């Protein structure tokens, strides 16, 4: 739960793959739709993420992305420590599952306002990050990181 | 230059279009490559940006994206005030130009490490946001927004 720790998560809808990164300490997320989960797609997504937030450590979502030399090359380039995703803490599996369930619920709630799944997923990222539960995840991530910088 | 103000900017390279959003108060940027600037591409980029940072106002980059009903629909959806981009302050005009020239310089310096332009542009976003000039733009943007939340 340090300021720089993120978890990758891959979930499926509509025959497509949604790759999500979660900032563990806040629950803030970024996500994208890709046709399938390859090391090149995962590597590009992590390069995007690390240019936008100070990403110190990534727990990868599965062993194929942990092994991928393209993902390792991107984590070298961007200064990220690439780690496995083992839930040594079983609360981990559970938190991720219930996030995927929450996102899929939101996506269903907006799905009819968008022709393409990718728009619906970015609507769901926006609603997830701005939901107050009281602060939102987008408020928590800024507070945490600002506290770290100071 | 309040915490929620961003400026769009469209620049060209390799026969492609790089769309950039600039957080005016910090100089932090997000950018993507698209084959050409359309209201649909611009609208999706602003939906992405506003799910990730608390975007209150966007000064659009030209009158076609100001007029575009697709862009106005996305700014409605995401709660953004869509504004023109008139440099009532002529310094504005100059600041954007010299950012495009800096990004293009950075892209040149990385361009041979990437097959695709879009990778080089995200490398350039990462180097720009982490450059210390002293704090970096990624540091300034978190400080500014956290101060606003508190």
């Amino acid at each position: 739960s340090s300021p720089g720790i993120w978890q990758l998560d891959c979930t499926h809808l509509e025959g497509k793959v949604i790759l999500v990164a979660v900032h563990v300490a806040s629950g803030y997320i970024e996500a994208e739709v890709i046709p399938a989960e390859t090391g090149q797609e995962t590597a590009y997504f992590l390069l995007k993420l690390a240019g936008r937030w100070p990403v110190k450590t990534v727990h990868t979502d599965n062993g194929s992305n942990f092994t991928s030399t393209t993902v390792k090359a991107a984590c070298w380039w961007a200064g990220i420590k690439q780690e496995d995703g083992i839930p040594y803490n079983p609360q981990s599996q559970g938190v991720i599952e219930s996030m995927n369930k929450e996102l899929k619920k939101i996506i269903g709630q907006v799905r009819d306002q968008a022709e393409h799944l990718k728009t619906a997923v970015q609507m769901a990222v926006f609603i997830h990050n701005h939901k107050r539960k009281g602060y939102s995840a987008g408020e928590r991530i800024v507070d945490i990181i600002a506290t770290d910088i100071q | 230059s309040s915490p929620g103000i961003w400026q769009l900017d469209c620049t060209h390279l390799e026969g492609k279009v790089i769309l950039v959003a600039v957080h005016v108060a910090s100089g932090y940027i997000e950018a993507e490559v698209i084959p050409a600037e359309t209201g649909q591409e611009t609208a999706y980029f602003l939906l992405k940006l506003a799910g990730r940072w608390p975007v209150k106002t966007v000064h659009t980059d030209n009158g076609s994206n100001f007029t575009s009903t697709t862009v106005k629909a996305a700014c409605w959806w995401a709660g953004i005030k869509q504004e023109d981009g008139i440099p009532y302050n002529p310094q504005s005009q100059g600041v954007i130009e010299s950012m495009n020239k800096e990004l293009k310089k950075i892209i040149g310096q990385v361009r041979d490490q990437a097959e695709h332009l879009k990778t080089a542009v995200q490398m350039a976003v990462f180097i720009h946001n982490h450059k210390r000039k002293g704090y970096s733009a990624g540091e300034r943007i978190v400080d500014i927004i956290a101060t606003d939340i508190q």
């Binding site: 090359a73 380039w77 | 490490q113 097959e115 990778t119």
Partner: peptide
């Protein structure tokens, strides 16, 4: 091809 995005 010795590129980050195409290690081939």
């Amino acid at each position: 091809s010795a590129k980050i995005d195409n290690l081939d």
